[PDB]
Each structure stands twice: as C-alpha cells, then as structure tokens.
Design an enzyme around this catalytic site. Sequence first.
Site, PDB file in Angstrom:
ATOM      1  N   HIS A   1      38.929 -34.144   8.256  1.00  0.00           N
ATOM      2  CA  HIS A   1      39.541 -33.419   7.155  1.00  0.00           C
ATOM      3  C   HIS A   1      40.809 -34.047   6.596  1.00  0.00           C
ATOM      4  O   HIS A   1      41.599 -33.357   5.935  1.00  0.00           O
ATOM      5  CB  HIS A   1      39.857 -31.992   7.591  1.00  0.00           C
ATOM      6  CG  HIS A   1      38.652 -31.212   7.982  1.00  0.00           C
ATOM      7  ND1 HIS A   1      37.684 -30.839   7.072  1.00  0.00           N
ATOM      8  CD2 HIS A   1      38.254 -30.730   9.180  1.00  0.00           C
ATOM      9  CE1 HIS A   1      36.733 -30.170   7.703  1.00  0.00           C
ATOM     10  NE2 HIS A   1      37.060 -30.086   8.979  1.00  0.00           N
TER      11      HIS A   1
ATOM     12  N   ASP B   1      32.768 -31.935   6.586  1.00  0.00           N
ATOM     13  CA  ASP B   1      31.949 -31.835   7.801  1.00  0.00           C
ATOM     14  C   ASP B   1      30.476 -32.174   7.611  1.00  0.00           C
ATOM     15  O   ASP B   1      29.790 -32.446   8.590  1.00  0.00           O
ATOM     16  CB  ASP B   1      31.994 -30.414   8.359  1.00  0.00           C
ATOM     17  CG  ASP B   1      33.337 -30.048   8.957  1.00  0.00           C
ATOM     18  OD1 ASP B   1      33.795 -30.764   9.864  1.00  0.00           O
ATOM     19  OD2 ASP B   1      33.894 -29.011   8.547  1.00  0.00           O
TER      20      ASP B   1
ATOM     21  N   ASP C   1      36.158 -27.981  18.748  1.00  0.00           N
ATOM     22  CA  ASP C   1      36.404 -29.281  18.166  1.00  0.00           C
ATOM     23  C   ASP C   1      37.689 -29.311  17.331  1.00  0.00           C
ATOM     24  O   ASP C   1      37.621 -29.316  16.144  1.00  0.00           O
ATOM     25  CB  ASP C   1      35.203 -29.805  17.381  1.00  0.00           C
ATOM     26  CG  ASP C   1      35.275 -31.286  17.097  1.00  0.00           C
ATOM     27  OD1 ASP C   1      36.340 -31.848  17.177  1.00  0.00           O
ATOM     28  OD2 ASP C   1      34.247 -31.861  16.752  1.00  0.00           O
TER      29      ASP C   1
ATOM     30  N   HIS D   1      38.428 -33.400  15.829  1.00  0.00           N
ATOM     31  CA  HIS D   1      37.943 -33.966  14.554  1.00  0.00           C
ATOM     32  C   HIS D   1      38.859 -33.678  13.368  1.00  0.00           C
ATOM     33  O   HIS D   1      38.776 -34.360  12.340  1.00  0.00           O
ATOM     34  CB  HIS D   1      36.515 -33.476  14.231  1.00  0.00           C
ATOM     35  CG  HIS D   1      36.458 -32.142  13.556  1.00  0.00           C
ATOM     36  ND1 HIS D   1      36.830 -30.973  14.183  1.00  0.00           N
ATOM     37  CD2 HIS D   1      36.040 -31.787  12.317  1.00  0.00           C
ATOM     38  CE1 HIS D   1      36.659 -29.958  13.353  1.00  0.00           C
ATOM     39  NE2 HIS D   1      36.196 -30.427  12.210  1.00  0.00           N
TER      40      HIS D   1
ATOM     41  N   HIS E   1       0.801  -1.225   0.000  1.00  0.00           N
ATOM     42  CA  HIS E   1       0.000   0.000   0.000  1.00  0.00           C
ATOM     43  C   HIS E   1       0.838   1.281   0.000  1.00  0.00           C
ATOM     44  O   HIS E   1       0.279   2.386   0.105  1.00  0.00           O
ATOM     45  CB  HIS E   1      -0.999   0.033   1.169  1.00  0.00           C
ATOM     46  CG  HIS E   1      -1.780  -1.234   1.340  1.00  0.00           C
ATOM     47  ND1 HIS E   1      -1.357  -2.270   2.148  1.00  0.00           N
ATOM     48  CD2 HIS E   1      -2.958  -1.630   0.810  1.00  0.00           C
ATOM     49  CE1 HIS E   1      -2.244  -3.249   2.104  1.00  0.00           C
ATOM     50  NE2 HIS E   1      -3.216  -2.893   1.283  1.00  0.00           N
TER      51      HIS E   1
HETATM   52  C1  LIG Z   1      40.891 -26.199  14.719  1.00  0.00           C
HETATM   53  C2  LIG Z   1      41.395 -26.101  13.443  1.00  0.00           C
HETATM   54  C3  LIG Z   1      40.527 -26.101  12.379  1.00  0.00           C
HETATM   55  C4  LIG Z   1      39.163 -26.176  12.598  1.00  0.00           C
HETATM   56  C5  LIG Z   1      38.664 -26.265  13.876  1.00  0.00           C
HETATM   57  C6  LIG Z   1      39.532 -26.279  14.942  1.00  0.00           C
HETATM   58  C7  LIG Z   1      37.296 -26.330  14.083  1.00  0.00           C
HETATM   59  C8  LIG Z   1      36.441 -26.314  13.008  1.00  0.00           C
HETATM   60  C9  LIG Z   1      36.922 -26.243  11.730  1.00  0.00           C
HETATM   61  C10 LIG Z   1      36.052 -26.259  10.627  1.00  0.00           C
HETATM   62  C11 LIG Z   1      36.542 -26.158   9.342  1.00  0.00           C
HETATM   63  C12 LIG Z   1      37.904 -26.088   9.181  1.00  0.00           C
HETATM   64  C13 LIG Z   1      38.763 -26.124  10.256  1.00  0.00           C
HETATM   65  C14 LIG Z   1      38.280 -26.183  11.533  1.00  0.00           C
HETATM   66  S1  FES Z   2       1.705  -0.500   3.274  1.00  0.00           S
HETATM   67 FE1  FES Z   2       0.141  -2.021   3.642  1.00  0.00          FE
HETATM   68  S2  FES Z   2       1.289  -3.852   4.163  1.00  0.00           S
HETATM   69 FE2  FES Z   2       2.829  -2.299   3.895  1.00  0.00          FE
HETATM   70 FE   LIG Z   3      35.497 -29.555  10.248  1.00  0.00          FE
END
Ligand SMILES: c1ccc2c(c1)ccc1ccccc12
Ligand code: FES
Ligand SMILES: [Fe+3]
EC number: 1.14.12.12
Lengths: 192, 192, 192, 446, 446, 446
Positions: free
Chosen positions: D213, D362, D205, D208, D104
Amino acid sequence: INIQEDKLVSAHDAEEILRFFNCHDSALQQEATTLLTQEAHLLDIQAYRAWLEHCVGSEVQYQVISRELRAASERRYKLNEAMNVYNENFQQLKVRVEHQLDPQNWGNSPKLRFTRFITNVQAAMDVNDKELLHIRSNVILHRARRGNQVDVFYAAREDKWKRGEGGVRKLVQRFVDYPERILQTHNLMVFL
Amino acid sequence: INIQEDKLVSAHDAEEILRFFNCHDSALQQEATTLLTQEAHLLDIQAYRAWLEHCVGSEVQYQVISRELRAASERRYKLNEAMNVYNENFQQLKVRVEHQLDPQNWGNSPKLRFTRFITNVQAAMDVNDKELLHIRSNVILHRARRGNQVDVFYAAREDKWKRGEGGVRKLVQRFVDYPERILQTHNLMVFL
Amino acid sequence: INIQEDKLVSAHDAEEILRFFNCHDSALQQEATTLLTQEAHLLDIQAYRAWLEHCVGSEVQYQVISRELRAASERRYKLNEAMNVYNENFQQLKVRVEHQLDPQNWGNSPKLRFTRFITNVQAAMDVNDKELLHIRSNVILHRARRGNQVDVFYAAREDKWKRGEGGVRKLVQRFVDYPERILQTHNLMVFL
Amino acid sequence: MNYNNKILVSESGLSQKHLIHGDEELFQHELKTIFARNWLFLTHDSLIPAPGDYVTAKMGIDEVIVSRQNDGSIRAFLNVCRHRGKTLVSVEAGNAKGFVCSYHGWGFGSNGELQSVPFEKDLYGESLNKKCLGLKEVARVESFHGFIYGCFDQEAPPLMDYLGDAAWYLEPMFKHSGGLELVGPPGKVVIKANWKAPAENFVGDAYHVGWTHASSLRSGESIFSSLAGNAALPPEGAGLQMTSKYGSGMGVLWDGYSGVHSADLVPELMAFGGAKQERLNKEIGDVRARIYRSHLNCTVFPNNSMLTCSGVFKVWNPIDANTTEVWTYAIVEKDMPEDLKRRLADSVQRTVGPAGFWESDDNDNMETASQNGKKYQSRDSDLLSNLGFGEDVYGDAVYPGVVGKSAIGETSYRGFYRAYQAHVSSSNWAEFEHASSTWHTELTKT
Amino acid sequence: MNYNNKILVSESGLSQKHLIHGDEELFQHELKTIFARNWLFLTHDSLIPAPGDYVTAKMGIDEVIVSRQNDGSIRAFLNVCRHRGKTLVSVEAGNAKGFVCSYHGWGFGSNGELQSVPFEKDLYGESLNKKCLGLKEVARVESFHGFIYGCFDQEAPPLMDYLGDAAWYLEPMFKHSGGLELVGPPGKVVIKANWKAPAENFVGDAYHVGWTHASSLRSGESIFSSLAGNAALPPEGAGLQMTSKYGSGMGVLWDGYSGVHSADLVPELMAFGGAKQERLNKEIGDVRARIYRSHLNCTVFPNNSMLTCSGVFKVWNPIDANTTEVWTYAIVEKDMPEDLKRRLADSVQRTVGPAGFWESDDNDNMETASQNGKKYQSRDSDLLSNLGFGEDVYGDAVYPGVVGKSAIGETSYRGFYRAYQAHVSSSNWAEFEHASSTWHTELTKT
Amino acid sequence: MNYNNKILVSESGLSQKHLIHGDEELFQHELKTIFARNWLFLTHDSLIPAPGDYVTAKMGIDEVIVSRQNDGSIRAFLNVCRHRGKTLVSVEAGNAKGFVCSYHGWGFGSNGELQSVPFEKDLYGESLNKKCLGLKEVARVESFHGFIYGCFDQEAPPLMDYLGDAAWYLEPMFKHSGGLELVGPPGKVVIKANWKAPAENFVGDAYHVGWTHASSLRSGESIFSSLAGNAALPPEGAGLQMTSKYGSGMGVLWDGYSGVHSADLVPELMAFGGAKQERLNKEIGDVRARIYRSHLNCTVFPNNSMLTCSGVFKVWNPIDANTTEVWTYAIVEKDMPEDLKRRLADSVQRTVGPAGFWESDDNDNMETASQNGKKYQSRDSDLLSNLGFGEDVYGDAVYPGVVGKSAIGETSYRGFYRAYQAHVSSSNWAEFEHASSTWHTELTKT
Ligand SMILES: c1ccc2c(c1)ccc1ccccc12
Ligand code: FES
Ligand SMILES: [Fe+3]
Ligand SMILES: c1ccc2c(c1)ccc1ccccc12
Ligand SMILES: c1ccc2c(c1)ccc1ccccc12
Ligand code: FES
Ligand code: FES
Ligand SMILES: [Fe+3]
Ligand SMILES: [Fe+3]
C-alpha cells in the site's frame, strides 16, 4: 458496388449502401440522431408506454430475423431462410409492453437495468415517398439483472420513420437481421 | 411521461427525460460532444492531472452509486437504498490521481490500456441557473492489463458542467447509478 | 499536457492531444464522421473491393501493432518494443481482400457477420500539409460466425486521410496500438 | 486426495501447500469441513431491525433468507423452494410476512413454514403434509453484539466460545463503545482469488502494508502513512498479534483509531476515539480502553474479516478455488454523530470498497498467489508463515490467546491454518476438538 | 484412466484415440509426463543478450523468469515468490539485477537467490535461512545455436541428443548459415484447440497445404502457389519426411527458400538463399547446402514448431485440453541485410501471426478436431496417421532418422505419437528409454 | 457415485435428488445411459424433402448430418471426418451429393461412404481401405408421421413401441389431421438450465401455468387466459395426464385448440380445429377427434417436447449440467391455408421462441432450480412430484397408459423419472426392460 465483383455482398446490402452514398443532408442526420437518442432514452428508463406513444407508428412493422447458416455456394436448397424473432404490428408490441408492465411479471423484480449505445447513424429521405425517412443505426444494448446476469446485444437497424400525429416522426418499420445465430444472452427479450 | 401509467419508470428518470425533450439546441449538443470526447481522450491516455486541471471544477461532486436489489412492490423497508462506490470532492479525486501517478503503484506496471466509447449525448441548459449545463451521455469503458485481463464497463452519466477559470466548461457533478449490482470486473477503479 | 508532471502519458499521446485541442472545426468533424460511418458500412457488409476503391489511398500504410509489456520504470532494455499485426501497403491489403473473396476460403462459409461501432471522432487539418486530414476515432468491432463464435474488438485509430482520385478523401495511414496483449478472439483477422 | 492423511499444513502452522489456494477437489471438501461446519456471518440487527425485515446472505455457496421474527428473534432458511427447488427470493433486502414461489405459487411464512399451496384442497386434498415441508432451516443462529452469524452444524460451539480468546479484543469496540451498527448495503465485487488469500491477509498481515500500500499510504495521508514504501518500521511495542483455538485472530496496532482514513477524517476521528477512551478507562481499565481505540485487523474464522476503527467489514464469499465474491460493509459506532457516520461509511468504500484505492493495491497479490496454486510446479510447494515462530506466548497476564508481542509477524496465520487443517482432516466437531486438544502448545513450540 | 495400460496410440503410431485432444484428466497427466519431463523452448540469445536481461516464458502451464547472468550463462526460475507465492514479475521483458515482490517486498537476485528481506534483522533476526529460499530453479537450461530450451527434469537427455536425427536437418540453417536471430516480441493469441493439433500439423502435415490454404496460396502468389486447391501435387522427389527417437520431426520441401512469403519477397529471398547455398556447397557438401535453403516444417517435441526459410517460430503453450496460447516469432539469418530482416519479420506475422491470413485457414481445422475429442461418440474413435506406412526407412546413407522419401505423408505423425505414448505410459526417463529401445523398428514395420 | 445403487429417484417417482440437475459426473453418465441409448429428435421430412437435402442436428452433445438418400430413405452420420476428426459440415442446412473435409480434402458421399481421397493413387496406392472409412453412422433412424428420430443404440425398441401409450394421444394430430409440417428454421438460444428442467415442465406441468405465466396470460388474451395469477382453477374434468413405459408423457387440456396464441388468432384457430374435428368424428370417433383439437403438452423422452395446437416443437439440447441449447420450431397442419401457417409460425416464436414472452416467464424458474442442484445444502434434498399420487390408473377402457383423470397433477413427472432412473442404473436395454417389468404397478401404488 458491383456484387458480381464484391462477391461477399448481398443484393439487399448493396441496395442500402446506394441509399446513403447518394445524397448527404447533414441536418437530416442530426434530426435522426436526436430521434434515436430520445427513443433509446425512453427505452433505457423502461418508459415503454411513452415509447409506444411518442416513437412508434400505428402502421409499424417491428421485425428481427434469425437466418439459418447456409453454404456460401448453396444454390439448390430453397426452404424458409429465416425465422422471425420479432415480427410485430402495433397491437403485438402493445401486448409485449403490457407484459413488461404487469405487476405479476415476476422476472421484472428486482427491476432490470438497460443501457443502450446508438452509433453510426445515417439518414436519407425516400426517393418516391418524400415523407418517408430511411434511418440506419447500430446498437449495443446492455441488460443487467439479478446481481450477476449481464447480457450484451449487438445489431444494425434498418428503419423507416414517418411524420404522424402532431407532426411527430414515428417508427413505421424496423428491420434487424440478428448477427448471432445461437443466442448466448438467455433470450432476445429486449427492444432493439 | 406519466409514471402512474408507465409503471416501471422512476420519478427521477421521468424528471431527466423532460429536461431534454423540452428544448433542443443543436449547437449545445455539439459543444457537449466535444467536451466529452476531449475528456475521454485525456482519461484514455492517462493524463489524470490534465483531466483535473482542464475538465474538473473545484466544487465537483463525482458520484457512482450501487443500489441494493429490492422488490418492485417493496413499500415498507426503508433503510439506505444505495452505497457510494465513488462520492468524491476535488481533493478526494486528487488523492486518487496521485495514487495513479505514484511510482510505487505496482498495479500500474506494466502500463494499463484504456479505451472509452462515449455515445447518446444530450445537452440542456438549466432553467434557473443559465450558466449550468446539463449533459447526459453513455460510456463503454474498456480496460486491458497484464496480457489477458480485460474488463468492460457500461454506464449512463448525468453530468452538470459550468464555465470556470478562463471560461472553460468544467464538470461540477457526475452521477452514475451503476447498472450491475455485483461487479465482474475485479474492481471499479476507473473514472467513468 | 506536461509529461514530466503527468507521469503516465507518453510523448506520442501528448503530441496527438495538442493536435485536436488547438483548433475546432465543427464541419470537419462532421465530414470525418460521414467518411468513417461510410467506411464502416462498406466493411460491415463485406464490400472489401468497394472499401479498397473508395476508402483506401494507393500510398496507404495500414498498421496495427502489439507492444511488449515492459516495466513502467524500464530504462535499459532496448530491443524491438512492438510487432506488426498489420503493416500493409495497398498491394498487401489487396492480397488480404482477395483472400476474403476467394471461393475456397472455407472459413467464410457460412458467411460471417460484422457490426462496427465508431465513436469519439475528432478531426484536424495538418499544420504543414493543408491537404492532409488527421482523424482520430474509436471502434468496437463485433464478429459473429458459426452459430456460437462471438469476438469483440476494441481500439483507438489514428488516421491520416487525403483527397485522391475524383477529389475523394481516402485513408493514407491508419495506426492502431492494440490494447490487449494476448488476443482472446481466435485471431485479429478483421480490418479495424 | 486423502484428507485424513495429507499434510496440507505443517506442524505449528509453519507452512501450507500452495495447492490449497487452487485445488477444486479441496474447495469442494471445504464446503463440507469448513463452511457447513463453522460460524458464518449473515447480517446485523441494524439491517433487519423490525419484524418481517429480511435479507439474503451466502453461507458458503448456499443462499439463505435471514428474517426478523415477530417475537424479535432471527431465523434463517435456505433460499430454495421445497417443491421443485426454485430460488424463492430474488432480492437482497425487504420486508414481508412470507415468500411466494414464482413457479407454482407455494407460500412460505417468514418463519419458514409452508403456509399455503394454491388450490391445495382441489389438488392435494388432505394428503400434503405441510408441517414437513417448511424451508430447510439453518440449525444455529446467534448474535455477537448485534452481529448475526449462522451455522449449519447443530454440534458447533456457541458463537461466544467459538470466538475464543479473540472475543476479549473485540469487546471494547463491539460492546463497551455502546454498540456498533452495520451500514448497508454492501459493495459486491468478484475477484479471481481463493477466499483464504484475503482471509489470511486480514487475520495476520501487517507486514505487507508498507510495501503493498505504498502508493495509498503516500496519497491518502492516513495515520499509518509513515510506513509508505518501507520507509519506516513501526516503533518498539507498536502492537501485537493474537490467535485462538477455533482459528479467529487479529493484529493490534496501538492507538490507530483513524486507520486507513485519509487526512480529511483523521483529526475528528482521533478526537472522538480519544474522548470515549477517557470515559472507558474508568469502566473497563486503561489497557482495554486503549484496545477500543486501537486498529484491529481480524478474521473471524473462516471467511469474515474486519478492520476496527477503519470501520471495514468484509465477507469473502466462496465461489470456486480461484473465485470469491467480496462483500464490503462499513461499521460505525452508534453514538457517533450522524454526519460523521455518513462520511465514515463513504470513506470505508472509498478506501476498501468496489473502487477502494487501498483494496486495489491488494488485487494482484491475492489473485496471482491463488492462481499459482493451480500451476503444476507450485502445487506441492510450501507457503511460508514462520515469522515470529518461537516467540509466541500463551496465558499472558494481560493479553489472552496465543500472542506475539510484536506489531508485525505471522502468529495469526499459524493459528488460522492450524484450525483449518484440524477441520479439513476431521469428520465432525468431536474430531476437531480431539485434533485441537494441544492447540496452544503446538503454536508456542521452540 | 490407467495410463500404463490404456492404448492411446496404436502400434507403429498408426492411429490415436480422438479423446487425446479433449480429455482434461489426460491433459493434467501430460503436465507431468510431457511438459515437466521434456525440453521446452524459452527464448533466444538475441532477446536477452546482455547481463541482467530477462524475459518471462511459459513451460507447460508454469511461468518462468529467464535471466542472463553476469558470467554470460542463462538461468531460469519459477516466477513465484518463495514467501506466500505471489507472481514475482508481471512484465514480458526487461533488464534488472533482481526482482522485488510487491506483496511483502522480498528481493531476489537475477541468480534466483533471496538477497533481501525487508527489516530482516528486526523481524526474523538471524533465523531466516535465505540460502534455502532461492527461487525454484529450472534444473536444465541448454542452447542449440542460440535457441534456449529448459527442462524441469534433471534426468533428461542433453538437448543435442534429445533432438536426435532432427539435429542434422536443422544444422545447415541453424549453424552453417552463420546463425539465426529471433525477432521479438512475439504475437500472442489464444485458440480453442489442443496443443497437439498445431504441433502435429507443423511436424508432418504437407498433405493439408493445397486444400486448407487454397485461398492463401492463390492470393499471396508464394512459391508453393501451384498447390492451390489441389490443382497440382508436388513433383516426384519434391521432398521428404523424417522423425526421431524423442519425437521431433519435420518435412523437407526441396528448394522452397521463400516459403509462405508473398511474391513481393520471392525474388530477393531466392537470390539470397541461392547465393549462400553456393558458398556452403564447399563447406558442408551439396546435399546439406541444399537442405539449408529447403523449407523445413518441424516440431521440436513437444510443443515448439517452426518453418525454416519462411522464418516462422511457434510455441503452442498449453492452457487446458481445448485451449492453447500461441506465441509467434520470426527467425532471420544474422547476415541478412537489416532491411530484409525487417520485411521478413513483418511477412512472418502477415502470413502466420495474430492476423496471419495463412494461419486463419488452419483455425477451424485445429479447433474442431480438438473439440470433437470431447464429444461422446468420438472419444473412442481413431485418428488415422497411416499414410506412407511400410515405405519408411531407417539408417539411410544420406538422410538420417526414420525417413519417408516422399514430400507428403504421415511419417512424422507416427514418430511424434510413438514418443508421446512412450512418455504418457512411463513414470520417468529410464522407463521412456526402455519403452523406446526398438523405436525405429516399430516405425518401419510392414 | 455408484449408479447401480444410488437412489436418485424414489419409488413410484415420488421424489428426485436435487443434485440430478447439477451434477456434472451424472451429466457425463447421462450421455451414456440416456442420450446414447434413447430416441432423439433429428428433423422432419418437410426440412429435407428432396434427395441430397441435409441438415445438421445434435444428438446429445454429438453433432450429426441427416441426409435424404436417392432412394427416399434418410441416413444420419457423425459430423466428424474419418481421417483426423475435423468437423465436416459447418452449416445448418443445404443440398449436396456429399461433403468434402476442409483439412485434407477427403470426400464423403451423402450416403456416408468415403468416395474420394485427394491424390489417393500417388499417396496411398491401393492400400487405403475406403470401404472401412465411411462416416460413423447413426444405427437407427425412424419416422413418426414425418418426424425423424435417431438412436445410436441398435438394441433400442422401434420408435413406435418406444412411444408406448403416448402414441395413441399424438395420432389424431400427427396422423389423422392429414399430417403436420415442421416450419424452420428453428430459433436457437442457450439457457443456464439442465435439460431436465424444461423437459419435466413440458411433460407434466400444468400447475405452473396460472402463476408463472400470469403476466403472459393477462397480456395476450389467449384461451387459457382465465388462469392468470391463479384467479381460477380449470373446471372439473378439464383434462388429464398420462405417462408411459419408456418415459414419454403429456397433459391433455380439453378443447384448447388455440393454445398460447393471443386473441388475434383465437377465432380462426377455434373455427379451423372445430371444422376438422367434425369430419374426424366419423373416422376416428368422438373422443379421439376431440383429442385432435385438445392442447397436448408432451415430452418424447428424453429431451424433445411440444405443445400441440399451440404448434410448439422443442429440442432441449444438452451442453453440461447447467447449460442447454434450446431449439424452437413451429408445427402446422399441412392442410391449413398458407397464410394461417405463416401467422401461426410467427405466433409460436412470438410466444415461446428466442424472444417468446411466455418462455421468458419460465427462465428464472428453470435456471435457478437447475443451479440450486449444485449448491451444497441442496444436493441431497428431494424435489417433490407427489401431486395426484394414489389416484392414477392403468388400462382404462378409453384412455391408455398410466393416467391421472385430472387436468393438473404430477403423474407425468413420475413416469418420466421412473424411466430416467431405470436407464441411469442399467447398462443396456435388456437391463432397462428388467428394471421396468412392473412399471405401471409402481406408478399406480397406494
Ligand atoms: C494492518 C493495517 C492495515 C491492514 C492490515 C493490517 C491488514 C489488511 C489490510 C487490508 C486493507 C487495508 C489495510 C489493511
Ligand atoms: S412452488 Fe413449485 S418450485 Fe416452488
Ligand atoms: Fe492490503
Ligand atoms: C509444408 C509447407 C507449409 C506448411 C506446412 C508444411 C505445415 C504447416 C504449415 C502451417 C502454416 C503454413 C504452412 C505450413
Ligand atoms: C399446459 C399448458 C401450457 C403449458 C404447459 C402445460 C406446459 C408448459 C408450457 C410452457 C410454455 C407455455 C405453455 C405451457
Ligand atoms: S509473497 Fe512475496 S514477499 Fe510475501
Ligand atoms: S481431417 Fe478430414 S481430410 Fe484430414
Ligand atoms: Fe496450415
Ligand atoms: Fe411455462
């Protein structure tokens, strides 16, 4: 095709098969492929004016129907079998193109993204009008907008194309019987 | 195409249209079709080393962008319009291929299934570099894994290919502007 | 392709690549394209009898498998790797066609809608049987029914075609390894 | 489920009920007790530097407009028209003095005020109180060295206090480096995981990395590459872990300034970081200068994560219990050469963006751990986070917070989930404070 | 909804509230009272014959690993890591001495035990009690002539007792034939139906065959082909129906050994079955030898179905109230020639597999009957299963169970749904037993 | 949520809680209190003119068969088999003396009666009481000049009384014109909006037309084209708004007989309408003859809308709180030339059908306003409908109902939502009546 034996085949569909099985003109299929790839490119980049100017004939009928679901054995009920999602002459297509280009068409900001995939191209010259080219092709049309809206359309297109201004072949009829009865794509606001 | 009149068309897109409308070389379109069908076959069977060796030039730039959604009328905001989902030289593609082939790539067991559909192929020789071939094509890429994961990608590809070792035409640039802003396919870890 | 180096590639897939990279016969690829476009047209209009009569050889094997998900490193477990979704001779295809055409096949009222997109066509003559034509192609198959049911299938097809009655090329083997392990399409009751 | 009583996280953060990753009623309860209550990342100064610059952002499942005001401040408003509730802004970024609704035509200023109503005189006369129809404003908007966070709850601690002991660790990079810039626009991808799965992975983490990885470590040749496939464990004293009262925490891997980046960037990065460290020794001391060029894997509670040095900046935007919209930006040091900034940004996306080969490692871990939370026999099962328990300290003379003086452990999980449980079972900030009055004692038990 | 009080199934199983096929709260309640309580099909000896062989299977919505032990026994475990809940195994079948998690590398034995933890000494010291961190084991795993079933509830009846009066009917084929093998791998397809729709159809529904499968009957030329389009009703005494205390039941169609198989297999099958019947007459008696080569359409409560002789074996795996994952195997007699076994397996899939032309006839019936259960005006409506009521017997001198001595009726629906209601309204097996102390009297009324 | 107590709509209909467009529990409650209680559009005489003609229609989320009886009446039945609940009819229209179920072959008459059961004698004997197994019938089916509505609640007011003061406005076009025909079949498209968003827009929303449809106004050259982009406001006395006791209401835009239709139809339509108006002056008076050829934007509560003169007829079929199935028909005057009728029908679809360029302008407004109703910070926010409040009248000497004598306002929103709230908080029609005994006084306050 004998449609008395092939019980599932419509008279219309049987007529269109015959058109393409008869004669094969490899060069014509290649001309049709080019024409349709170029049309699809213009539409994908949203060059709607260029599309009208280069691809669409002044005498065009651009028609997309939706057919009511009826019993395969239905023989008595006789009322309108279909509605027209599109049934456009040149001026009506022009109205739609102007709507797309209007700076207050809020639905077009941010800009939409179209990608079309054209396949199964067949081409045959008309028997009676040696200047009318029948082209059949199928399209997958991908429309993406507003981050996470994605709509994919699927259709077979029965076209007639004819040489117009400057000897350029232009669309004089497109007919699509849309395969999905209830659309699950928000609308059918795309040029198939 | 006049982009002052066709208000929705980008300067870049208008430039690419002109490239293919100018001259049509049917044999070149057929060469391009073969090259792209073979590339897609190698990728579908996950012959990533063969792909690098037979399809990818040492000077390649393999780039897939994602463009921020901006107002169609935006004229002041000037910062980085896009990010690079891919922007890879040969060595970087090699790193990715090695990642795919590593026996501790746990994501690849059980083996993935790829199926690519390449359409709308157009080919034109460069005006200035008579050895550079411009090829445009669209891809639907289907990736299935782990019983019920199915991801389908849709894109237009603007390529440059050039004859390299042994006279084999190889990809020297691929550019994709990915049409969906927010991916709904878990990731874009596929070679478009 | 060396499958010792390209670690993800199966022996079977490596064998099929070699078939098409060897010799390119542009006219044959065009013959194959026509044959497959016509087959797909007959199937899309549900001319299943015409399909059997014009496209399918008496000695046909029409096979679609589903392969159990196994560890990429699996070397000991040896039992049946796959099941047959389809593994049909001519008579068995005929049974299926009769099932489609039966007026008490309640599932076919209202009439289904099929649209097939055939891409990535490659063709090569057999080395040993000069009358056997190897054709590879990919299909997207769209099936719509009952207002809002939409199922899309994706597959690569490894075919053998051979000239039969009247010199017409007919399908003598189709092999599909279906890429999705768990179907999300209600069934696989479509001729890929 | 009775959130006052239900033990979703056990004492000392040692375990969590697996249902927390799958339960949609709890997800809805989190919208209230986590997302509407806590500080959420919006944007950076570098993305809306000039008056009228705006971006859209998520805050939980809500969308906000974040706008640079004429006076240089930033205000944020719900992206919802005050008339019939249409979404006001449909783009991600721009510059405007205001926003007009496409339904509107109501016109709102960059300051949220209802500035114009079409034909107001003819239609409403003098009767529409526009003063009371401004956009719903985000109560609290504060900056941490250019990084702009919002909070819907006026009662929240100031952002600085909210960062608690985590702030000391971020300052060398966020402040003493000369400042960071956020490079946009972000990658955006939906994953089928609960927002807590990636949040916990980034907060704590390191365990992991070698196994998950393995393939990315081996392929990319990055500085942590010796970990590939658990071929090697980090040395003695290779790093530490920390956590804080309000849930934010991080790992520290000493000296890992090139982070996840492949060998093509390692030499240039290691030189650049070492050079700045040498200057910083004199200004902030050797320990903190070293922290500047050490890899920090951090979650700013609840759903903002980063890898400093790698230059990764993440928002885990919640959609439902098994759906998250991942936003990925790059962070770069302002005084880096522009060409390095560009290659660093590309490398962030290359490794952890929409086609990030590391992030791909991941996906199944995050998605299946989250989805298993819905499965009947797993709902009442216990996710374990006991690694290093009974060896954490608090109030150390050098490293603040609850700290595990080891590179790999689950200290930061425990503090994250202690804070989570205190919020889930509390109706407001006062109750969270009361539930957290012995936070560090709880974490350092046994 | 109060499951103690709500009458979902009327007395004698005569009707069921249509909502049972659509209500998601009831679906969730079924996970507890049906799927976590009862015996569920896992696999066959023939699929994991050797030590270390394993498959994955669903048990309700949970996933389990089913592993052949070194001592020849089979044990089953939740496919969920005991650390942070990642899915352990991502394949359907294999051979391994154990399973390593791809998140942090924890290693579990084929016996479920936590066997290794990366860097356990350096990280956990002596403090991780691995003895208490074995995979969550399926309490009960038993075999019926090679067919392996599991139950999460230690209190369940032994599988043999659970099969009740149904066991007598299955034994000629499952035992006296020399044994069956399951041919894998299964077809797997998702349908938009409640798991009970196909379960009830297989347990008791001969009535539909002529009309639903008219087109398949006429096209395939199978032995039941005279039924096509209700052109003919089976003769007098063409078969019977039965049901049992714990819900399992079946139809018996005398002599239909070639079942759904098209005319290309009819002669060979009818010869093979007749030949074995002649030998069996001497061993188990004429009636039971005839049962061996008669078509049994059976559901082993709750969600395992089969057609003996046709060789169809089905699992209707529940996903939600209107979604089911259908697994389709073939069963073959061990002493059949290998070429026949192969053609029989192909024919099973041909007729009732993912592209099964028979199964396609059923889809709309199953899907719409299930989905209508969600529609407002149908929720409280009554699904009828009264055909043959007041003509069933119990304790017959020849045919055990509650039995309808007619080929077509709804006897087996009534026993299926009597058992279903007794479980849904009970908190444990003792309460089911108390609710079932007059089961056969209830079914044979009037 | 306690629907007796919760104020979802404020006094006088001045505001509504935004959650009403997003809350699934309220959606479920609407199935009971709105859709099962009120009159819903089914079809037109013109679509089932002859005995045996039938169509399927939705009534809420239920599906019905609507059948012309031999005696010329129309009856409607749930499209659900009385045996095991399969959907009886799978097509949209046809002609039949009855319907046979594809599961077990039960045969129902066009009159709903269970007429045949396969092999009834052999199977059921004399024991099946078919008299009690007729299809579940729609209690009430009435006609408004050929437009057929149904109601599941026997206690409902007659349709004429239910239309209340709205009937007077529709009669010139629906009755005095000589009659309308509905041109089928409809377009059918799913939108991600709550059914109330389009319902409220059609009932009362002239304010949006200039801004929302700026592009369509400018491109199509229709009679309302001067409004494009709020370039102009309608003149003084360009129209009015009305509403009624049972929730139906409309806008009146004087003389706009060509409506949304592009300039290609304007001259012919303006001539045709003017010509009939001249004849009608003598029969029904000048004011009502003018109403005949004035554009009425109307919602027949709850979910049937129309634009007279434009010839648009809509059903907003509810699926869930953010999903609606939009059915679009054309209405034409019976005595129009057939070629005009055909072009008018095409023009309706062209403008507001599945590819309707006007309707496309509305999509984001409807979808985002509905979806924002789910977002946490918007659920308890107030949608405003106060435009024109305190200027409405009741009992005017010329124009009946609660009336705003201005072309643009929110009168009809207020009456729509007053009725909605009275139903949502009531258990039956008697309670609605008690809650509505001062309906017009509530609406005309201040
Ligand atoms: C230490 C090093 C790399 C990572 C993490 C922790 C934690 C998550 C992560 C996620 C993608 C890439 C690297 C990482
Ligand atoms: S002006 Fe009416 S819904 Fe935004
Ligand atoms: Fe990771
Ligand atoms: C008797 C005979 C065949 C069948 C049934 C009962 C029951 C279900 C079924 C399902 C598929 C094919 C055949 C059958
Ligand atoms: C007045 C005039 C046109 C309209 C409305 C009110 C209301 C809704 C609508 C919707 C589509 C097209 C036109 C309209
Ligand atoms: S989740 Fe399996 S080892 Fe950590
Ligand atoms: S469900 Fe309709 S006849 Fe059985
Ligand atoms: Fe069946
Ligand atoms: Fe509108």
